[PDB]
């Protein structure tokens, strides 16, 4: 079910929530009102963890549900191409 | 049947219809009356998705129907050579 898949998804949904919290902290910037380069770099690479995460999430969700929508290896290809 | 193969072909026939819609939008150009380079580039690479798509389609259709017309690996070779 949802709770069983979330028990399988323990190592990814918590990381997605923590990265959304980090993005919300970056909305108030977490510090003085300043913008730079490594600011934008750490603003970038907290997205790639959640996109690899939701790739693993949809791998678990197609193992849970049906396979009417076949070929997921190109889906992990496209999820990394989005990054 | 046709509906069962189309249920197997859900991730490709919708992409073919959407790319034909994008080509029809490019017929009216989707914007002001102008032609360029990236116009012609995106006019190109919406064809390679439907040709790889119909390669997957004929893979499913030879899994559905007979194999009186043997050797399909060279058929995916020729479908990419057309691109
Ligand atoms: C509590 C924290 C504790 C941390 C403890 C460890 C600290 C470690 C610190 C390591 C060093 C960090 C340094 C961070 C930068 C400090 C200095 C920031 C100010 C200026 O830094 C120099 C500036 C470039 O800034 P850039 O920080 O490098 O880049 C990111 C920044 N946004 C940006 O877009 O720029 O360039 C210049 O002023 C001269 C070149 C200008 C550009 C064009 C080419 C000229 C070429 C020819 C030669 C002559 C020139
Ligand atoms: C709502 C949208 C928001 C988008 C927000 C992000 C925008 C990012 C924009 C990034 C920059 C895009 C730039 C697009 C082009 C803008 C300028 C277009 C006008 C002219 O651009 C320069 C022109 C070439 O046009 P080319 O756009 O580059 O190519 C595609 C175009 N068809 C084509 O067939 O050409 O060349 C020249 O005028 C000089 C060279 C002429 C050719 C021969 C060689 C000369 C060699 C020697 C040196 C001296 C010269």
Distance B28 CA to ligand 1 centre (A): 48
- Look-up: residue for tokens 């934008």? A40
Return d(Cα A75, Cα B31) in angstroms, integer: 31
Write the CB contacts of B69 (distance below 8 Å, at least 6 apart in sequence).
Answer: B62
Q: Is the CB of A37 under 6 A from ligand 1?
A: yes
Deposited resolution, Å? 3.3
Return d(Cα A22, Cα A6) in angstroms, integer: 21
Return d(Cα A33, Cα B17) in angstroms, integer: 48
> Distance between alpha carbon B33 and the CA centroid of its chain, in Å?
27
Q: Nearest chain B residue to A66 by CA: give it.
A: B8
Task: Flag if A69 and B11 touch (Cβ within 8 Å).
Answer: yes
- Using CA atoms of A27, A28, A34, A38 in order, give the dihedral in degrees to the nearest 10: -50
A68 touches chain B (CB under 8 A): yes
């Amino acid at each position: 079910e949802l709770f069983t898949n979330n028990a399988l998804n323990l190592v990814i949904i918590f990381g997605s929530c923590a990265a959304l919290i980090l993005m919300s902290f970056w909305f108030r910037r977490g510090n003085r009102k300043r913008k730079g380069f490594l600011f934008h770099a750490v603003q970038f690479l907290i997205y790639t963890i959640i996109i690899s995460a939701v790739g693993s999430i949809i791998n678990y969700v197609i193992e849970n549900y049906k396979l009417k929508f076949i070929t997921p290896g190109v889906i992990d290809f496209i999820c990394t191409s989005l990054i």
